Every structure is written in C-alpha cells, then in structure tokens.
Amino acid sequence: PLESQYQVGPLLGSGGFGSVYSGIRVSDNLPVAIKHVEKDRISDWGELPNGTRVPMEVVLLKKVSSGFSGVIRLLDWFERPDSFVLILERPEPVQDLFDFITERGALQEELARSFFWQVLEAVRHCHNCGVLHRDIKDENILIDLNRGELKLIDFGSGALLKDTVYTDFDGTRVYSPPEWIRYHRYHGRSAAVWSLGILLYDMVCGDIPFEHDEEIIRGQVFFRQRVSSECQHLIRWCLALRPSDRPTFEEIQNHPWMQDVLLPQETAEIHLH
Numbered sequence: 429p430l431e432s433q434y435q436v437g438p439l440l441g442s443g444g445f446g447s448v449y450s451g452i453r454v455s456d457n458l459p460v461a462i463k464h465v466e467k468d469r470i471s472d473w474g475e476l477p478n479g480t481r482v483p484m485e486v487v488l489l490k491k492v493s494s495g496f497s498g499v500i501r502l503l504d505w506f507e508r509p510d511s512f513v514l515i516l517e518r519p520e521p522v523q524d525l526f527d528f529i530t531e532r533g534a535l536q537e538e539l540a541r542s543f544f545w546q547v548l549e550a551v552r553h554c555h556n557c558g559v560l561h562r563d564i565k566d567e568n569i570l571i572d573l574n575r576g577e578l579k580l581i582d583f584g585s586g587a588l589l590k591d592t593v594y595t596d597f598d599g600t601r602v603y604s605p606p607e608w609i610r611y612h613r614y615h616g617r618s619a620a621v622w623s624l625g626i627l628l629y630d631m632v633c634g635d636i637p638f639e640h641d642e643e644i645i646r647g648q649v650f651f652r653q654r655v656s657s658e659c660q661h662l663i664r665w666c667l668a669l670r671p672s673d674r675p676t677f678e679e680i681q682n683h684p685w686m687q688d689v690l691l692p693q694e695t696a697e698i699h700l701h
C-alpha cells in the first residue's frame with residue numbers, strides 16, 4: 429500500500445506536530461511531504477462526512493483542501509496501528525517565513541504588504557470553509573520561492589469555526605490574545621486578528637513585540653525599527669486590548685497601508701529571484 433505508493437526521502441522536520449519527511453509520489457514523480465502523527469499524542473479527534481474516527485487535523489484539512497493554493501493541500505491519509513500518516517503537497521524550492529525573516533532580517537514594507545495580504549486571503553478561505561487555524565505564526569507559513577506564493581501549514585491546533593466562546597487553547601502563547609491570558613476565554617475571529625497583528629509586527633520589525641504575559645496584558649507597542657505611520661496604525665489596531673476594538677478582515681484589507689499590493693509573481697521577481 430502506502431510504502432509502495434511513495435518513495436521516502438530525508439526528514440524535513442519534527443516537533444509538537446510530529447515528524448515530516450520529504451517524499452515523491454511514485455506514479456507521477458510529484459513532490460510530497462509525509463507527516464507521521466503518533467495516536468497517543470492526538471488529543472482532538474473528529475469524524476469525516478462518513479463517520480470514521482480520525483485526528484481533527486484530517487477533518488480540518490479535508491474541509492479546506494480544494495483549488496485555492498493559499499493552504500497546503502492534503503493529498504491522502506493512512507491509519508497504522510499506532511499512528512496516522514498524512515500525504516501533503518510539497519512546493520520546491522520552499523522556505524518557511526521564520527527562516528526567511530531570520531536570514532534576511534526585517535522585511536521591506538512592499539514585501540510585508542504582499543505577504544500579509546496573501547496570509548489574510550488564506551485565513552478568509554479557512555473561515556469560509558468553517559475552519560479556525562488557531563496557530564497563525566511565521567513558522568506555520570511556507571514561501572513557494574519561484575511563484576512568490578505563501579501557504580498556511582499545521583492545522584494540528586485548529587478547530588471547527590463557531591460563534592460562541594472558546595475555553596481551550598493549544599497554539600503559541602506569545603501569539604495569544606490578552607483575553608486568553610487573563611480570562612482563558614476568546615472568540616475565534618478577534619483572536620485570529622490579534623495573532624495577525626503579532627505576525628505583521630514580526631514581518632516589519634524582524635521579531636515579535638511581546639515576550640511575557642505582563643507585556644501582552646499591557647499591550648503597549650514599541651517600534652524597534654523604522655516603520656511607516658500607516659503600518660504602525662494597522663498593527664496597533666489589530667493589537668487592541670478589547671476584542672471588540674479590533675478591525676474585521678474587511679477593515680484590515682481596506683486599510684490605507686494595504687492598498688496597491690503586488691501580485692505573487694511580481695513579488696518573486698522583485699524580492700525573491
């Protein structure tokens with residue numbers, strides 16, 4: 429079965445998410461990523477339209493895995509006695525946004541605008557599909573270096589999108605909102621906008637704004653790099669302490685800083701090639 433269908437290459441990475449290997453689909457030589465997740469480590473379980481017991485990650489990936497290239501697509505999955513195996517698409521050449529920022533430093537605003545816009549479109553796709561990611565951050569964003577296209581990865585901390593309060597959270601603390609830190613309660617969309625504010629600051633400053641719980645709660649934004657007034661305004665808006673004071677996705681995309689975005693191919697030509 430799986431073992432004959434795929435040629436296993438080297439280990440790409442491992443962590444909280446499991447172990448991911450580079451691979452090639454034997455039928456058409458297609459580049460793939462093979463992700464292994466131990467059953468004993470899966471806390472959130474769900475069921476497909478048929479009713480098979482699978483990790484929540486598989487449920488969420490199927491709901492979002494269609495035509496749009498802003499989310500990494502689930503090609504297939506397999507159940508083993510003690511693990512689940514996920515076959516994912518693999519761009520080549522690729523680099524995650526964390527590694528990209530680490531190597532190149534703070535991004536030019538034209539580049540951050542293109543990247544941030546693409547993340548916003550990917551998050552809107554997830555929400556339209558009834559999926560909440562819950563771990564939007566530089567490490568969970570892949571850059572397709574040839575096309576200048578960004579892809580969201582790791583739906584392992586995600587949930588089905590709902591309009592009621594969430595009282596559980598297992599994403600990244602430094603990207604978590606003050607309402608979670610203080611009350612252990614948040615609403616999906618406004619918590620997503622907070623994490624987007626953390627991500628934008630990270631792109632234009634080269635590092636995250638807050639380290640400690642006290643800083644998150646105070647929510648005072650200091651700029652360590654030269655950043656335009658419009659970009660600073662948008663960041664401070666996404667990072668409003670009161671969830672109801674944060675912009676909607678529409679308000680972010682209509683912001684003066686978000687106007688005249690480059691197309692992904694133009695972005696690769698100017699900044700990546």
Ligand SMILES: COc1ccc(-c2cc(N)[nH]n2)cc1
Binds near residue numbers: 461517
């Ligand atoms: C280096 O290429 C990849 C490709 C895909 C992934 C991935 C996708 C999801 N949902 N988790 N991990 C990681 C690395």
